[PDB]
Ligand SMILES: [Zn+2]
Ligand SMILES: [Zn+2]
């Protein structure tokens with residue numbers, strides 16, 4: 001099991017990277033860094049993830065997906081401006 | 091006590107990406123004013139006046155009414171909680 005923390009930048013108004021891959025049946029720590037001037041969310045509904053991150057702040061979350069597939073990542077505030085991504089569990 | 095339906099005056103406030111229009115509104119103390127909040131932007135926004143205990147979230151392309159009856163004169167900060175740092179703020183003057 002990797003000690004690697006997966007880092008995701010939230011900026012105005014996009015995720016970087018906008019595709020991430022995490023291992024099935026393992027705990028992965030994600031470091032969510034909001035480098036933008038707006039509040040953003042990191043939301044993966046089908047994985048039960050919904051995190052709000054203040055501008056200039058970061059949060060760690062731990063995810064342990066049990067089903068392989070490609071899951072929708074969105075920011076709830078900016079979905080219509082293209083702030084979405086794909087989270088691949090394999 | 092009875093009055094006709096929708097007697098309170100209505101002030102429209104536009105929420106767009108990322109500003110309020112108008113960004114200064116004046117409302118009478120100890121009277122009810124209705125605020126019609128219209129989100130004309132592509133982002134979710136809030137209409138938040140912390141010192142008046144107001145916090146309304148409006149989804150893109152939607153609208154919401156809120157009626158307020160402030161008890162103290164002053165100038166209150168209006169913000170969008172998501173975009174305050176992008177300049178999305180205003181002033182609510184109660185007099
Ligand atoms: Zn966002
Ligand atoms: Zn998608």
Ligand SMILES: [Zn+2]
Nearest residue numbers: 038078133173
């Ligand atoms: Zn925004």
Ligand SMILES: [Zn+2]
Nearest residue numbers: 135170173178
């Ligand atoms: Zn806003």
Ligand SMILES: [Zn+2]
Nearest residue numbers: 167179180181
């Ligand atoms: Zn101000």
